């Protein structure tokens, strides 16, 4: 409808059948219809998803925080849980996930091990 | 076994012999964690009181949380009582 | 003159609101594509130049 | 035409159908143009309504979620001299 | 946008990659380079 500057040419929807009605100059439909073969094909914001595995942590714990610091990250951000297989479902743009991925490999540690021997001597 | 044992007479099931019970958590390969509670009861014949069963229900109850690997034999805990 | 442009990282969302006051107070347009991120521009070739080359520029983390 | 036969029948293995459906309508939000993910606890199966990208990236996030999981044969040992 | 008097010259703000379009003398340009340099200072 903007395509023509303030009308003249017209155009016309059908959303259930995904057909254009166009009424104007040729160039137009031709230049525009390169436009629909290149503007049908997919592009961004489609397959920007990642799934984290996690060690020893749980997979809600981490959520919780993550999406508590993720607001500052923010055109969106999805981090939601699963605690069958404790893995952590990612959604954002790569920069945003190679941030995420900097928090999870520097909370994903084997914590360390005490051995206590008290002993008691009584005379 | 499993005995009974006196809440006051309002008494009460309970078991009393070798017991078992794991609780992994298992990374993709090495360094397993486990939390284990395991105990060795008894059963007391000999030094009896003026009382009930003096049952040994604890003779040894170690209940701990440790992280092993997948072949090493280790030591989780122990007692040496000299006198 | 009419062109259309992709964005690698560049936002048309953002830009939107950029080009539109790229020309003074319009002359030129600009079309955004949030789905697809692309950028129907129709007018003069060096605010196109320019603007390709702040894309490449902007589309830089 | 479209908006026809955009249908998808998951199997699982490994995990049940409503709590994987409950993480992925969740994160289903942004890969929002309408998008269903509903549950079978029967036959433990997931119902996929989406198109065919989405459809991918669903089936992406499944075969990444439905693993054979890990056995352990715990020998505790008590010496008592 | 107040730096020239009550318009002429104009100024064009980039929030997300902090880009900075001006469209005017080149000695406001300079001076304004100049107190960008300052500016960005802590």
Do not use: C
């Not at chain 1, 020893?56 to 297989?85: V, W």
């Not at chain 2, 794991?22 to 105990?39: F, Y």
């Not at chain 3, 949030?34 to 521009?41: D, H, K, S, V």
Request: avoid cysteine.
């Amino acid at each position: 409808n903007n395509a023509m500057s303030r009308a003249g040419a017209q155009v016309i929807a059908d959303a259930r059948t995904n057909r254009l009605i166009i009424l104007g100059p040729p160039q137009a439909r031709a230049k525009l219809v390169q436009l629909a073969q290149s503007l049908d094909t997919p592009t961004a914001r489609s397959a920007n998803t990642r799934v984290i595995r996690l060690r020893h942590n749980d997979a809600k714990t981490l959520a919780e925080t993550l999406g508590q610091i993720s607001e500052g990250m923010k055109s969106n951000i999805l981090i939601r849980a699963d605690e069958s297989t404790n893995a952590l479902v990612l959604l954002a743009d790569p920069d945003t996930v190679n941030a995420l991925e900097d928090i999870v490999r520097q909370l994903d540690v084997p914590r360390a091990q005490v051995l206590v021997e008290a002993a008691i001597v009584e005379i | 076994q499993n005995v009974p044992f006196q809440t006051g007479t309002t008494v009460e099931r309970k078991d009393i012999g070798v017991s078992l019970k794991v609780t992994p958590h298992i990374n993709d390969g090495a360094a397993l964690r486990l939390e284990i509670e395991q105990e060795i009861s008894a059963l007391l014949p000999n030094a009896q009181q003026r009382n009930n069963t003096d049952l040994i229900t604890s003779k040894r109850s170690i209940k701990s949380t440790i992280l092993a690997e997948n072949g090493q034999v280790i030591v989780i805990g122990g007692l040496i009582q000299d006198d | 003159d009419y062109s259309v442009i992709n964005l690698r990282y560049g936002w048309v969302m953002d830009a939107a609101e950029v080009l539109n006051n790229a020309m003074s107070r319009a002359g030129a347009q600009v079309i955004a594509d949030a789905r697809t991120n692309r950028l129907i521009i129709l007018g003069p070739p060096q605010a196109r130049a320019k603007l390709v080359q702040l894309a490449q520029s902007l589309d830089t983390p």
